[PDB]
Design a protein around this ligand. Structure first.
Ligand code: CL
Length: 252
């Protein structure tokens, strides 16, 4: 019995190759993945990224699924993908496909514990624009993992969350807790923010966090960071309706 997560890998994952080289790619891949067994599946997308990279998308930009569900996620980075579209002259069982390569952001539906991709929803071309709450999640939320695995966490994460694009962002914290726990902080201990405003809140509880701080020798575009893992209360500024985090003020 194939799990939903496994069916997604079969139908949509192709890590073991960087892109759709040949124009016959789809022809071969659609066949080997059993997508032409009962019929020539009209269209399909393959993602040429590591499983972990695609799996991390489940902790990225939350967006509305095409089907009306809320469990879809758009990747912060563009990915190598291949769209396969059946040709007009394709006849089963010799299904024929036009192979199309692109670099785009992907949108997947995620499910389960662990929380992994179970459907491919769409692809989105460059670029896009961001809400305060969305930006907070990109810069400061890492729900996927329980903590840092090494001291290379920050080098990887700072880059993949686009925090080293124009310059090296010097200091930035990531919170390894659920979104609901972090959002709940907006209703916890009210405190003043560093800037003197009073829409800041300190979590009642310590949380698993990671402090990314650029090294003193680091220089753009070669941004180097030290990774420090810790358990501290966070302090966030909250705004809007719903009343959610929009700035990471400090941890204490
Ligand atoms: Cl920060």
């Amino acid at each position: 019995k194939e799990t939903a997560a496994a069916k997604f890998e079969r139908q949509h994952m192709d890590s073991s190759t960087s892109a759709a080289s040949s124009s016959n790619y789809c022809n071969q891949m659609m066949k080997s993945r059993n997508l032409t067994k009962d019929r020539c599946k009209p269209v399909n997308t393959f993602v040429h990224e590591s499983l972990a990279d695609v799996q991390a998308v489940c902790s990225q930009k939350n967006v509305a699924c095409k089907n009306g569900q809320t469990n879809c996620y758009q990747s912060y980075s563009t990915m190598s993908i291949t769209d396969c579209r059946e040709t007009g002259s394709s006849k089963y069982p010799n299904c024929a496909y036009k192979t199309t390569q692109a670099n785009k952001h992907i949108i997947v539906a995620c499910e389960g514990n662990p929380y992994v991709p179970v459907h491919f929803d769409a692809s989105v071309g460059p670029p896009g624009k961001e809400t305060a709450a969305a930006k907070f999640e990109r810069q400061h939320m890492d729900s996927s993992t329980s903590a840092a695995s090494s001291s290379n966490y920050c080098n990887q994460m700072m880059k993949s969350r686009n925090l080293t694009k124009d310059r090296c962002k010097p200091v930035n914290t990531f919170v390894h807790e659920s979104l609901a726990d972090v959002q709940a902080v907006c209703s916890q201990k009210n405190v003043a923010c560093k800037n003197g405003q009073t829409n800041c809140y300190q979590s009642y509880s310590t949380m698993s966090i990671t402090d990314c701080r650029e090294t003193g020798s680091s220089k753009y575009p070669n941004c180097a960071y030290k990774t420090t893992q810790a358990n501290k209360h966070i302090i966030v500024a909250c705004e809007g309706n719903p009343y959610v985090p929009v700035h990471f003020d400090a941890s204490v």
